[PDB]
Amino acid sequence: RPVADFSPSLWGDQFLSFSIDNQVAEKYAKEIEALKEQTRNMLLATGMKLADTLNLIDTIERLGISYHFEKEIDDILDQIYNQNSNCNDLCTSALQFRLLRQHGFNISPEIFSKFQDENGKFKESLASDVLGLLNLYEASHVRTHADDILEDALAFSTIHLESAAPHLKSPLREQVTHALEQCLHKGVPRVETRFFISSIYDKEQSKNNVLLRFAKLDFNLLQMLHKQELAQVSRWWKDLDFVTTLPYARDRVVECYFSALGVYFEPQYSQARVMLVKTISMISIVDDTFDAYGTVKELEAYTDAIQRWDINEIDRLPDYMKISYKAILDLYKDYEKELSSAGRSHIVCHAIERMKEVVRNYNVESTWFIEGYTPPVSEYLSNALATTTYYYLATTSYLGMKSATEQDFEWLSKNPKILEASVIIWRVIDDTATYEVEKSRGQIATGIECCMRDYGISTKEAMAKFQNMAETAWKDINEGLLRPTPVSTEFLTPILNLARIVEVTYIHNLDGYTHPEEVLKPHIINLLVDSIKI
Ligand SMILES: [Mg+2]
């Protein structure tokens, strides 16, 4: 019974209830339909140049209203992919690369040859093209293992954007400054959409009023929906009262909602988000139980209870674990009921199997701690990957998705490279971040520890190696998105977002879920409190 420590929730009952004025909602919806159809006609414009078509698509995407034009934007990029017209200018070429690649079109990086000398490096003469540099920088983060051409693209555009930025006009200066701390591709969609609309496009002189208006309204309307869901989930979490009954666990439902919200923000994924938040919260309790409270013997009985997954096993568990255990089983029972109507209740097991896997490994992590076992990196990862809970959350995100078939879950059960990459990113990033705290304590059992021992290298060199694993992972994720995809892209995005969440949460190399204050707090306010002033 180790000392408390964990900071209490900052929010309180701030989101406990949200009465949505259907008056303001309908008006917003009414005008959005108009602006929507008006934006549609913009995309279907015939005599439009390449650069214009790309800038238009990029903007609608950054404004976060592109989910209205899945088909439209696709048929247009498809054509652009098949016509292969050379734009000759860096700005447009880089953007054509990124947008196509992000949509799975395997466009060749040969397009970037004309901007490199006979040596293969970028012409230093482009150092004055700010828009060209910015779009390249963005594009360098979508490269795969086959794109060795873009090898130096990131370092190139970076050093020169940092040099040029201080004298740029606004909002361009701000856009560049923000891109340097957060590229678009590895950032959370609503978070970047919130930043684009309010900090950039609104302050853009050449802004398209129909698009900005559309953007602000749509964003604000969806925020109402998110506020509702969070309310609903906040009430659910109070009825469990784990804040009083389990004072050792972290109270972070708003933070858990944020993740669910970064996995998907569309209204159609409302049922999905709710299920997902509940599970991220629940598994958070379990992580806290193994990590800071439970004892050797108790954890063992807990892991067995989870594997059996009955209810009779509850008696073998101490009183405090009986609450956790039952909560978990009742949660899945609700899921089974929620899906009963569509007849999709039979998929819930897939998530349960992953949870057992998560717990088994949690337990092993514990055993290693007690023995003081420092396994070789390979052995460490074979266990430390599932403890990230990403195979688990990844499977959970499919529950609430009405389109998810049994086949989609089977594909996911084989541990796809795309899923594997996402899990590794969380793993290495988390270990890099949480190293000193665990070792200043002592923990010869941590990720960086096994790495330094296994390879006989310094701490600096070990974290450096972990960074490359994350870079490798990202490249695998990008490759993963390329067509033909194993499953509908609709099922690849959740995984992609889970990795975006890691990048956003551990950006200052600090645990964002445990220490929200300086990392996650602003985002939550920007997405779930403050609306965009119309
Ligand atoms: Mg643990």
Q: Please write down the HEC assignment for all residues of 129-169.
A: CHHHHHHHHHHHCCCCCCCCHHHHHHHHHHHHHHHHHHHCC
Query: How far does the centroid of ligand 1 lie from the alpha carbon of residue 290, in Å?
Result: 5
CA 277–ligand 1 middle distance (angstroms): 19
> Longest Cα pair distance anywhere in the chain, in angstroms?
73
Q: What is the dihedral of CA 270, 273, 275, 277, to 10 degrees?
A: -140
Q: 179 and 234, same structural domain?
A: no
CA-based torsion, 145, 150, 154, 156: positive or negative? positive
Query: What interhelical angle do 319-340 and 348-371 show, nearest 10?
Result: 160
In whole angstroms, give the CA distance from residue 406 to residue 93.
40
- Ligand 1 midpoint to CA 438 (Å): 12
Q: How far is the CA of 414 from the centre of ligand 1 (A)?
A: 25
Omega within 30 of 0 (cis) for the link into 166: no
What are the contacts of 37-44 at 24+ separation with CB within 8 A? 38/210, 38/214, 39/65, 39/68, 39/69, 39/210, 39/211, 39/214, 40/68, 40/69, 40/72, 42/210, 43/69, 43/72, 43/73, 43/76, 44/72
Q: Do 156 and 305 share a domain, yes or no?
A: no
The residues with which 116 forms a beta bridge, in sequence order, are 122
Say yes or no: 413 and 506 in one domain: yes
Distance CA 456, CA 461 (A): 10
Say whether 529 sits in a helix, a strand or coil: helix
Distance 289 CA to ligand 1 centre (A): 8
- Asked if residue 501 and residue 418 are part of one domain, the reply reads yes
The pair phi, psi for residue 310, each rounded to 5°, is: -125, -85
After which residues, if any, is the chain broken (C to N > 2.5 Å)? none
Smallest CA-to-CA distance from 321 within 337, 301, 338, 339 is with: 301
260 lies in the same domain as 176: no
- Other Cβ atoms within 10 Å of 229 Cβ, number: 21
Q: How far is the CA of 369 from the centre of ligand 1 (A)?
A: 10
- Non-local (6+) Cβ contacts of 73 within 8 A are 43, 57, 60, 61, 66, 103
How many C-beta atoms lie closer than 10 Å to residue 201's C-beta? 21
Q: Rounded to the nearest 10 degrees, how much is the dihedral formed by the CA atoms of 85, 89, 92, 96?
A: 50
Give a three-class secondary structure readout of 105-119: CCCCHHHHHHHECCC
**Neighbouring C-alpha atoms within 13 Å toward the C-beta of 186:** 30
The answer on 166 and 257 residing in a single domain is: no
Distance 385 CA to ligand 1 centre (A): 12
How many structural domains does the chain have?
A: 2
**Structure-determination technique:** X-ray
Query: Would you say the C-alpha torsion 141, 191, 236, 217 has a positive or negative sign?
Result: negative
CA atoms within 13 A on the CB side of 522: 8
Domain end call among 206, 238, 268: 206
Residue 382 Cα, ligand 1 centroid: separation in angstroms? Answer: 15
| Pair 17, 53 in one domain | no
| 3-state DSSP assignment of residue 485 | coil
Helix orientation angle between 270-288 and 348-371, rounded to the nearest 10 degrees: 20
Per-residue buried b or exposed e for 475-510, using 16+ beta carbons within 10 Å of the residue's own CB: bbbbbbbbeeeebeebbbbbbbbbbbbbbbbbbeee
- DSSP string for residues in 387-413: GG-HHHHHHHHHHT-TT--HHHHHHHH
Tokens (6 digits) for 179: 């891109």
**190: number of Cβ within 10 Å:** 22
Domain check: are 212 and 150 in the same one?
no
Task: Give me the residue label for tokens 């404004």.
Answer: 63
Distances (CA, A) of 488 to 99, 266, 478: 18, 17, 15
Torsion angle in degrees (nearest 10) through CA of 248, 10, 258, 337: 60
Cα–Cα distance between 27 and 450 in angstroms, integer?
A: 58
Ligand 1 centre to CA of 278 (Å) is 19
Amino acid identity for residue 55 in this structure: N
Cite the DSSP H helix spans in 241-288: 242-245, 253-263, 270-288
**Which helix (H) or strand (E) covers residue 86, if one does?**
none
Q: Are 123 and 129 in contact (CB under 8 A)?
A: no
Please state, in angstroms and as integers, the Cα–Cα distance from residue 88 to each residue in 114, 349, 378, following that order: 8, 53, 46
Q: How far is the CA of 235 from the centre of ligand 1 (A)?
A: 27
44: which 2 tokens?
A: 């279907």
DSSP secondary structure of 277-313: HHHHHHHHHHHHIIIII--HHHHHHHHHHHHH-SSGG
Decide: 190 and 494 in contact? Cβ < 8 Å. no
What is the token pair recorded at 34? 């108009």
Residues 255, 270: Cα–Cα separation, whole Å:
17
Q: Within a 13 Å sphere around the CA of 440, how many CA atoms are in the beta-carbon half?
A: 5
CATH number for the domain that contains residue 247: 1.10.600.10
Give CA–CA dist 450/460, Å, rounded.
14
Angle at 419 between CA 418 and CA 424, to 5 degrees: 100
**Residues 246 and 97 reside in one and the same domain:** no
Angle of helix 348-371 relative to helix 406-413, nearest 10 degrees, comes to 20
Same domain, 228 and 358: yes
Structural domain boundaries, residue 411:
3-46+207-533
Query: What are the angstrom distances between the C-alpha of 508 and each of 42, 353, 462?
Result: 40, 34, 18
CA 404 – ligand 1 centroid, Å: 31
CB 516 within 8 A of CB 255: yes
Instruction: State whether 88 and 214 are in the same domain.
Output: no
Q: What's the 364 CA to ligand 1 centre distance in angstroms?
A: 9
Within 10 A of 2 (CB to CB), how many other CB atoms are there?
A: 8
- Rounded to the nearest whole angstrom, what is the distance from the C-alpha of residue 288 to the centroid of ligand 1? 6
Q: How far is the CA of 377 from the centre of ligand 1 (A)?
A: 18
Q: Do residues 119 and 263 share a domain? A: no
- Detail the residues annotated as belonging to a binding site for (2E,6E)-farnesyl diphosphate: 250, 287, 291, 427, 430
DSSP state of 480: H
Give every CB contact of residue 271 below 8 A, 6+ residues apart in sequence. 338, 400, 402
Ligand 1 centroid, distance to 92 Cα (angstroms): 47
Is 272 in a helix, a strand, or coil? Answer: helix
Taking the CA of residue 366 as centre, how many other CA atoms within 13 Å lie in the half-sphere pointing to its CB? Answer: 24
Distance of CA 470 to the CA centre of its chain: 14
CB 188 within 8 A of CB 502: no
Which two structure tokens, joined as six digits, stand for 106? 């395997």
Ranges assigned E (strand) in 44-136: none
Rounded to a whole number, what is the distance in angstroms from the first to the last CA of the chain?
51
With a CB cutoff of 8 Å and minimum separation 6, the contacts of 228 are: 18, 20
**Which of 206, 221, 236 lies at the terminal end of a domain, its last residue?**
206
A 10 A CB-CB count for 327 gives: 16
Cα(363) to centroid of ligand 1, in Å? Answer: 8
Contact yes or no for 239/195 (Cβ under 8 A): no
CATH code where residue 157 lies: 1.50.10.130
Question: What is the rounded CA–CA span in Å between residue 347 and residue 337?
Answer: 12
Q: Which two tokens stand for residue 378?
A: 């390979």
CA–CA dist 79, 95 (Å, integer): 15
Whole-number Å distance between alpha carbons of 464 and 432: 9
| Kind and range of the H or E run holding 66 | none
Nearest residue to 177 via CA among 165, 185, 186, 189: 165
Give the Cα separation of 391 and 387 in Å (integer). Answer: 9
DSSP secondary structure letter of residue 531: P
Q: Using the mean position of ligand 1's atoms as its centre, give its distance from the Cα of residue 145 in Å.
A: 33
Looking at residue 5, what DSSP letter applies? -
Last residue of a domain, one of 173, 206, 239: 206
d(CA 391, CA 310): 23
Q: How far is the CA of 361 from the centre of ligand 1 (A)?
A: 9
CA distances for 236 relative to 16, 326, 464, angstroms: 10, 15, 42
What phi and psi values does residue 299 have, to the nearest 5 degrees? Answer: -60, -45
CA distance 121 to 140: 14
Residues within the annotated binding site for Mg(2+)? 287, 291, 430-431, 434, 438
Partners of 122 in beta bridges: 116
Question: Distance, CA 294 to ligand 1 centroid (Å)?
Answer: 10
Helix (H, G, I), strand (E, B) or coil at 92: helix
The residue to which tokens 């490798």 are assigned: 472
CA of 359 to the centre of ligand 1 (A): 9
Helix (H, G, I), strand (E, B) or coil at 457: coil
Instruction: Using only the alpha carbons of the chain, give its radius of gyration.
Output: 24
Contact predicate 191/504, CB 8 Å = yes
CA 381–ligand 1 middle distance (angstroms): 15
CB 218, CB 65: distance < 8 Å: yes
C-alpha 192 to ligand 1 mean position (Å): 31
Q: Which residues are annotated as a binding site?
A: 250, 287, 291, 427, 430-431, 434, 438
Assign 23 to helix, strand or coil.
helix
Tell me 63's DSSP state: T
H/E element holding 210?
helix 209-238
Give CA–CA dist 152/160, Å, rounded: 13
Cα 403 to its chain centre, rounded Å, is 21
Q: What is the dihedral of CA 143, 145, 150, 156, to 10 degrees?
A: 80
**Measured between alpha carbons, how far is 199 from 66 in angstroms, rounded to an integer?**
19
How many A from CA of 308 to the centre of ligand 1?
Answer: 21
Residues in the chain: 534
Instruction: Let me know: does 327 contact 314? Beta carbons within 8 Å.
Output: no
Structure resolution, Å: 2.9
